[PDB]
């Protein structure tokens, strides 16, 4: 036996990119552990990132905005949300709703 990790170390500062590609129907949830901002939120949100398969570090950037438009008026619907983020409504569909039942925004 006597087998196992020895000791590695990467001294490179890589960056993140954005690309669109097809996926596999039967696949695991989004790997949060690692993504930036994963600590910014709690298990509550971290859940959506998995089920909805959305990045945690980004899910936060949408908060402000989403709460921004509403804050001004007070009535923000899906037709407006999906726009505030300019992302596939399918995604927000899970977020927005979660916010409506959370008491962060209101349904127009």
Swiss-Prot record:
MF GO annotations: DNA binding; transcription coactivator activity; zinc ion binding
GO terms classed as biological process: chromatin organization; mitotic cell cycle; regulation of cell cycle; regulation of cell division; regulation of DNA-templated transcription; regulation of embryonic development; regulation of protein stability; regulation of transcription by RNA polymerase II
Ranges of the DNA-binding region feature: 91-100
Result of changing residue 93 to A: Loss of nuclear localization. Reduces DNA binding
Domain of life: Eukaryota
Primary location: nucleus
GO cellular component terms, A-Z: ATAC complex; mitotic spindle; nucleus; SAGA complex
Compartments where located: Nucleus; Chromosome
Every SWIRM domain range: 21-108
UniProtKB keywords: Chromosome, DNA-binding, Isopeptide bond, Metal-binding, Nucleus, Phosphoprotein, Transcription, Transcription regulation, Ubl conjugation, Zinc, Zinc-finger
The protein's assembly and partners: Interacts with GCN5. Interacts with NR3C1. Associated with the P/CAF protein in the PCAF complex. Component of the PCAF complex, at least composed of TADA2L/ADA2, TADA3L/ADA3, TAF5L/PAF65-beta, TAF6L/PAF65-alpha, TAF10/TAFII30, TAF12/TAFII20, TAF9/TAFII31 and TRRAP. Component of the ADA2A-containing complex (ATAC), composed of KAT14, KAT2A, TADA2L, TADA3L, ZZ3, MBIP, WDR5, YEATS2, CCDC101 and DR1. Interacts with CCDC134.
Stated role: Component of the ATAC complex, a complex with histone acetyltransferase activity on histones H3 and H4. Required for the function of some acidic activation domains, which activate transcription from a distant site. Binds double-stranded DNA. Binds dinucleosomes, probably at the linker region between neighboring nucleosomes. Plays a role in chromatin remodeling. May promote TP53/p53 'Lys-321' acetylation, leading to reduced TP53 stability and transcriptional activity. May also promote XRCC6 acetylation thus facilitating cell apoptosis in response to DNA damage.
Name of the molecule in the record: Transcriptional adapter 2-alpha
Organismal lineage: Eukaryota, Metazoa, Chordata, Craniata, Vertebrata
Residues of the full protein shown: 343 to 443 of 443
């Amino acid at each position: 036996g006597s087998s196992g990790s020895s000791g590695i170390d990467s001294g490179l500062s890589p960056s993140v990119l954005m690309a669109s590609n097809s996926g596999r129907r039967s696949a695991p949830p989004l790997n949060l552990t690692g993504l930036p901002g994963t600590e910014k939120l709690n298990e509550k949100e971290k859940e959506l990132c998995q089920v909805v398969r959305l990045v945690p570090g980004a899910y936060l950037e949408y908060k402000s905005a989403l709460l921004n438009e509403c804050h001004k008026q007070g009535g923000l619907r899906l037709a407006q949300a999906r726009a505030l983020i300019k992302i596939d409504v399918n995604k927000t569909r899970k977020i927005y709703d979660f916010l409506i039942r959370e008491g962060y925004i209101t349904k127009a």
